Design a protein around this nucleic acid. Sequence first.
RNA 1: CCCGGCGAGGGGAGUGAAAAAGAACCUGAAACCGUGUACGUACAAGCAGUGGGAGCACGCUUAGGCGUGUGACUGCGUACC
RNA 2: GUGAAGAGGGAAACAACCCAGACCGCCAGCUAAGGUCCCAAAGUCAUGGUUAAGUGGGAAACGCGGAAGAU
RNA 3: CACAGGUGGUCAGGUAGAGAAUACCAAGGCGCUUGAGAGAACUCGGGUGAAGGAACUAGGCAAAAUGGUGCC
RNA 4: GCCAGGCUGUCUCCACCCGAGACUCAGUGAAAUUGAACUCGCUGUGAAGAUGCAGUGUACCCGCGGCAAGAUCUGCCGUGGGCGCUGGAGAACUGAGGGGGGCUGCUCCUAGUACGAGAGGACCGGAGUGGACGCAUCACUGGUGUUCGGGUUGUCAUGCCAAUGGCACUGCCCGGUAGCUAAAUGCGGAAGAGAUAAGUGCUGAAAGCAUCUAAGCACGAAACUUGCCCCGAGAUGAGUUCUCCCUGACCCUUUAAGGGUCCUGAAGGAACGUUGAAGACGACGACGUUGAUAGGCCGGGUGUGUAAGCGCAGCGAUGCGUUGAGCUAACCGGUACUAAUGAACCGUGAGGCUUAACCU
Lengths: 114, 122, 175, 120
Amino acid sequence: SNIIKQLEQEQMKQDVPSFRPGDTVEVKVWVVEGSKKRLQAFEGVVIAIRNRGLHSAFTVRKISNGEGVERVFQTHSPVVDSISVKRRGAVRKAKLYYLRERTGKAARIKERLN
Amino acid sequence: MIQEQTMLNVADNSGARRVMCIKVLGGSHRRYAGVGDIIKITIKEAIPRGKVKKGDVLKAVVVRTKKGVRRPDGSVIRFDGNACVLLNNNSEQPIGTRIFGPVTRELRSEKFMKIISLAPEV
Amino acid sequence: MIGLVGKKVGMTRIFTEDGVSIPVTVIEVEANRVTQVKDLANDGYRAIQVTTGAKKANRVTKPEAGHFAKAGVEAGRGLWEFRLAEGEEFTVGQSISVELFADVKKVDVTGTSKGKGFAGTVKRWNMAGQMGNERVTVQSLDVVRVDAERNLLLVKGAVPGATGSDLIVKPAVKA
Amino acid sequence: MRHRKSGRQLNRNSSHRQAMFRNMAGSLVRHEIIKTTLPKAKELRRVVEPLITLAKTDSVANRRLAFARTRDNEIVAKLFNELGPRFASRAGGYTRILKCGFRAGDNAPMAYIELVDRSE
RNA sequence: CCCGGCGAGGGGAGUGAAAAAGAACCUGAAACCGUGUACGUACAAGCAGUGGGAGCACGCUUAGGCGUGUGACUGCGUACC
RNA sequence: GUGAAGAGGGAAACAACCCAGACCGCCAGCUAAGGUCCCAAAGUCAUGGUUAAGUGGGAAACGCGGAAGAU
RNA sequence: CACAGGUGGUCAGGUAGAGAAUACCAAGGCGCUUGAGAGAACUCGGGUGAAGGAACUAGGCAAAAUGGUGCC
RNA sequence: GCCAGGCUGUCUCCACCCGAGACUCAGUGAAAUUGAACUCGCUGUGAAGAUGCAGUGUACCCGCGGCAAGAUCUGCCGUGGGCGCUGGAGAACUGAGGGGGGCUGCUCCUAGUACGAGAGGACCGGAGUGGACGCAUCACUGGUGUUCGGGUUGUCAUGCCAAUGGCACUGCCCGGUAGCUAAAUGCGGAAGAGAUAAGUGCUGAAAGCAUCUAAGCACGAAACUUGCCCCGAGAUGAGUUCUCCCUGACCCUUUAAGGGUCCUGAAGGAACGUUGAAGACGACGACGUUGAUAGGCCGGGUGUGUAAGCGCAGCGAUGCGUUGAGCUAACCGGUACUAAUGAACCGUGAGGCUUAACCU
């Protein structure tokens, strides 16, 4: 109702850019080490976007050491600092779960050129 | 999460390629084992020469889980498959000095202080 | 000590400064004014009757209207009782806000589980009988945020009852 | 189960139910009045009111969409010409249901469903 | 003649000794199914009866405590071949 | 001797345990076995003894103990 | 029994099809004699699914994976 | 005949979805069995496990769905109709009693501490964190989501192209709204209290020693019960508290917990509708014009993905701007536009006798 909508919206920051699915993106994450905190950069490709209010989370996949690791980043969580788009893609598909099997050239995507 | 009789990917230079689970420890009448739990696995394939021989039975620990684990902030770490590294009851220090793929931040256990150094890719 | 009756609205997550997500269930806590007071001399025990909400005059039975008129307050959607902790007493018409829970840090939630149809033996005990619509209590829950001016209460975990249901939040007896 | 779900079962094949509702809507549009069971009448109203609401706006895409769920060129032509302007002022509630007792054949409840204007 | 559906069936009138003889037709019982009448039963445990038995209605000697309809309670009572 | 082919009363129930052989009816009295706190009809009756453990109200051989009995 | 069963021969189109098998249509015949209801547990016939393909069962018995052309 | 490998809910654990039965409404409708039934548990006996014998205890009467310990009956869980709690009615609870479980590993400081020649080495059970059970929830992890969207093979149809709809398991797939879901996350095995075995004890003889006891007279095990929640006054012993309604008349008799007639019809309920995260049918919750109860509508959100048409390019497949567009069931805030009308029925008209205290 109104109360829950107000509670959800009062904790929203208008800083996340609008990135299409399958678009390469970098994420800055705060990580706690020892008694301090530091920044970590994670580059990947957005596969699925599920923007349920403040519960908005997007899955970002990366290839490291020859293995695929996918992590879900919360759109508005304090843990996520900033989102930057480096390489722009274009796929006519909301979800990119199909590429888990593709590799090399097949996994690559074409430039948007919008 | 890992269940009984599940294949685990090998993330060490011990030469192992395919390892099968036989028994699950870490709790009486336990049905599943997490990433930070000790499991019992065997070996299916071994290199022609090395310290690991076919048929050996020894402990191991999962470094990566297909299902993944959650985070206090709601984040979830999911991997393309299950990866496990063999461990020994005595001389816990695994032979492998190199680990395939990244690792999570839950390896801060008392006996896992020597593995965080490895796996440079996070 | 004394619990208050509220209305479940929903549940979501709350983000902490350190970067921790915590489940929170949302309870609207309207001012639960007291209508009648029970005492040892007359009623045999110490208790106070609390009412909340509003009922349309047409849909309010005349006996209830007379009872509330004697209480000198508008008719609510229900009446509830809470045993006193042998502390300071209250008076009829004394509105009670959520401030009481602003310094407890531990509360218990009682409510009716969501109804369900016939359940099999495996579904029940892992015999068949009705499921849900039964009083159930979950204890040792810590309040996260309190908003007196908004009648909003956030409590960790999950509580019995879906959206639109009525529940009771009481100070945690166990500690 | 049974919690916050829409659509009465009307035990039948899903495609069979869809065709049944298409026929019901076509008949109601053609004759502006039907004499059918209440359980079916409710979902008939729920499925037909969107059609008339869409028909209130005239456009090639709207006509194609109406024909997609109607499959009757004459019925589609009847739309956008008479019903659209007739109920232009009104927003929603384009149908009314009046009970007329229980069906004698099998004691099944039955009622009339007709447009608000229905004439003139 | 009327109700009924221009049916089946029923209700009047008439004939008929009689229609409590109507073609399902002399005489018409119990098992079985219904209404009404009078009584008992919803705190009360077992071959369901036998004696005691207040109470509940009718007619009687117009009371005089009589019979019929029921049996709350109570002692006893573990079917036939 | 009983049942077979004999009822009735007592032993809480019970066919072989005790008294006792029913012609029928009666709102009468007296007895056999068994009882006389109640349940249930009778003495909370008298005299002289044992009992402190509910042994009574289940138990042998053996030095009060032995003694452990059935949802 | 208007039963769910058996009953001998002939007539044998179009589309994509090696095919009279396969799926929809031509002429033709039918909606099969109880219908409608929120659609519970449970039974029967099926579909999807995270960690696995045999760790339940004496038992790969149901189900599920592939289902070809020429060459390196 | 055998081996190595891939391959599915056979399973850990099953979760969800689509159809026919299972339940109700209107009608047809037979069987096996049947001495009669007012068809309880326990103990003892019995031709020997007793619904029927002796003793004891519980249970209002009658229905609906299954679990099958013995689907007619006995028995269990849930839920209904009638009845009384004594004028009637609506709510809130005390509570005689009843359901159940009280499990368990690792680490931290305590602490390398007391004690102990040294070696050796805790009580601690205070904090954090696992395993198994139950309860709660869908925001998160996902599964389902044949009612939403898109890709695509064949065929038919809309007079034909384009564009659409049906069939082929939902035709085959890719995603997914809401609900349900565990593999996901919140909590619990309390603390404290009473009685406690062993054991630990202040003074203490009889019997100038001694002793848990003879006199005065104290703690205590994870064993047991409360403490923890849930049902519960059908607890017929039928409870306690609050509030509301009825304040008429007349006649007769077998003259009293009597009967009858006219008027009255209170509060409340049921009756019917919208219906629900309530439901097999009952029942329960919100509303019924003095309204957001259901449908539709507006806007948002989610999902899917660049709809058709238009003009350009490739003589064709197709792409380009229109267009992050079109559509969107179950989600959210409003909207009376539509459907819940005025009403009828039951439920009454001062509440039985006795006793004790009050003003009369």
